[PDB]
Amino acid sequence: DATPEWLGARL
Amino acid sequence: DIKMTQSPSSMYTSLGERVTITCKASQDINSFLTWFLQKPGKSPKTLIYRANRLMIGVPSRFSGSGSGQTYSLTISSLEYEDMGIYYCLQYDDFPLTFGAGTKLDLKRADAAPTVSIFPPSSEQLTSGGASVVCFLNNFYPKEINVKWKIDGSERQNGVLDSWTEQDSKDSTYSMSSTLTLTKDEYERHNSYTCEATHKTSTSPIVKSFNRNEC
Amino acid sequence: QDQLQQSGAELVRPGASVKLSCKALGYIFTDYEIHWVKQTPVHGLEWIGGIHPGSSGTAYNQKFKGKATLTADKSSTTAFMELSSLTSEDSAVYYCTRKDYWGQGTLVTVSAAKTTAPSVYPLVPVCGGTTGSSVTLGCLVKGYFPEPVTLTWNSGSLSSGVHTFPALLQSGLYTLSSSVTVTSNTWPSQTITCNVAHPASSTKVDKKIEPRV
DSSP states (O other), X not given: XXXXXXXOSOO | OOOEEXXXXXXXXXXXXXXXXXXXXXXXXXXXXXXXXXXXXXXXXXXXXXXXXXXXXXXXXXXXXXXXXXXXXXXXXXXXXXXXXXXXXXXXXXXXXXXXXXXXXXOOOOBOOEEEEEOOOHHHHHHTEEEEEEEEEEEBSSOEEEEEEETTEXXXXXXXXXXXXXXXXTOOEEEEEEEEEXXXXXXXXXXXXXXXXXTTOSSOEEEEEEXXXX | OOEEEEOOOEEEOTTOOEEEEEEEESSOGGXXXXXXXXXXXXXXXXXXXXXXXXXXXXXXXXXXBTTEEEEEEGGGTEXXXXXXXXXXXXXXXXXXXXXXXXXXXXXXXXOOXXXXXXXXXXXXXXXXXXXXXXXXXXXXXXXXXXXXXXXXETXXXXXXXXXXXXXXXXXXXXXXXXXXXXXXXXXXXXXXXXXXXXXXXXXXXXXXXXXXX
């Protein structure tokens, strides 16, 4: 459902 | 370090009611926030991500809003299932941070506690120990104060309290207070009092016994 | 699908280490970050850090830099979190999260305590104290380790008017108490017993609440 518009910043 | 200020901290509600919870970030967080609910002894469950997008499977009565530093979670009509603690999480920047949460509570009429004190059992006394228990049962709201007194003077340690979660049937709360001592210290004093102070009254509810009486 | 499954409860000794795991299912593991969160009664929620399985990138809460180590394994789509030099301050429930999905959590207890059977004491009302249409009796389960423990009244036959309180640490061990309220004339004519079982130590203890004196 959700996309990397969750994090993605590869931490 | 972004600070999330969540409010209110405590929520007194009724089923069907419309509930609004607020989280203010100490700076712009660009909608990178989630709202989740956690029930006693259970793991978190997300309701909203990116400030206003519903997690698949989450009921539509839940909705989120906000854009800069202020975000709100709205529950259109509260359901029994919705009880628990709500939290907000910002993930716009490290370190990720949480609001202190808000406890959702089913409101009901004020109810004073039913207090009962219990001298040590004979078996425990034989073991060399002495535990004086006291139950403050079925009161509302959850906030209550308990103070122990031995031969008239307050006893601070040896005390350990435990609370129950709101009862699903009557909406009250309960807490157990245990004052532990050695047999020798217990047998050097006579009257043991349990004092419960609660909103439902100014003067506390006093419960006590005497060793010499039994 | 879409899910996070964590490993079982851990009972570790102070000064030791432990490594927790988080199995990811139903989604492309190398596309989302996995973060670990700590929760304790006293300190609430605390973000420990995160890792990107796709780039091995990590970020830690300064407070855990040097205490927690996050790794990820592409072939088993499992994120790992290792904690070293543990103290009771590290006893908590640990969660992994993709920020939307959360694992069910892993309970970590740091203690030197050894398996110990609970002492079970009958709690009778103060001599007399019959004043009232009801009577409250109690049961104190003291000094056991580890959890859990299950207690019921009259073999589960008595469930209404019962309040079993959450256990708490008392001098390295666990203590628990339960109250039950019945109508005045009911007790003591009819008997009320407290059933306490402690699997860990294969203990079964029932005990009737006998009036004092």
